Write a protein that binds this ligand. Structure first.
Ligand SMILES: [Mg+2]
Length: 218
């Protein structure tokens, strides 16, 4: 039997991508740049501030200083942090709380393997800290996803190998990072996005303990 589950935060446990989008949208406006919508935001999604800002600045040929590019990148970060202050337990995805409880009661270790720099904060605010044995610190890991480093750290931090674990993810980079750690991925989303060589549920309601068990035995 699997001895742990390693959780992605965004798109599995909750939606942090909504607040990111509004921070970049807000900045776009307060500058005068046009048309930062949700379709465009798919270019900003798994990418660092610098490139995101570069793409947002190219929508109107806007040239910036440097002591200004630094500032504009900092405004988006200040704004994201304002906006996530209202994350509540009411934002926990369906079936996640119940899965975590069933996991705590069956003595399966629970670890976070998210890119997010606000991971513990977001878990406090949603009232899920009690369930997690460890949180992978993405500043301590040398490389990001699709590298397997954050899933390895996540397992190690709860005293297991990746191969004793299942990873929960919603992105192709995330799936490939679970795969290279040696963990068993179970996707959330479309196999058009994530791949038909792995097991995927439509949404997080379908992440049950019983289902997780059936997948391991297969
Ligand atoms: Mg994700």
């Amino acid at each position: 039997m699997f001895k742990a589950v390693l959780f992605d935060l965004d798109g599995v446990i909750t939606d942090t991508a909504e607040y990111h989008f509004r921070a970049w949208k807000a900045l776009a406006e307060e500058i005068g740049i046009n048309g930062v919508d949700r379709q465009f935001n798919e270019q900003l999604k798994g990418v660092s501030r610098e490139d995101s800002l570069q793409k947002i600045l190219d929508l109107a040929d806007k040239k910036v200083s440097a002591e200004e590019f630094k500032e504009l990148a900092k405004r988006k970060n200040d704004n994201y942090v304002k906006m996530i202050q209202d994350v509540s337990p009411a934002d926990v995805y369906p079936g996640i709380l119940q899965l975590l409880k069933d996991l705590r009661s069956n003595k399966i270790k629970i670890a976070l393997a998210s890119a997010s720099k606000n991971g513990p904060f977001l878990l406090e605010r949603m009232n899920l800290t009690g369930y997690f044995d460890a949180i992978a610190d993405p500043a301590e890991v040398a490389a990001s996803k699709p590298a397997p480093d954050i899933f390895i750290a996540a397992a190690h931090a709860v005293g297991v190998a990746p191969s004793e674990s299942i990873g929960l993810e919603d992105s192709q980079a995330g799936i490939q990072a679970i795969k290279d750690s040696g963990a068993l991925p179970i996707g959330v989303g479309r196999p058009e996005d994530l791949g038909d060589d792995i097991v995927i549920v439509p949404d997080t309601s379908h992440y049950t303990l019983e289902f997780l068990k059936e997948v391991w035995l297969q």
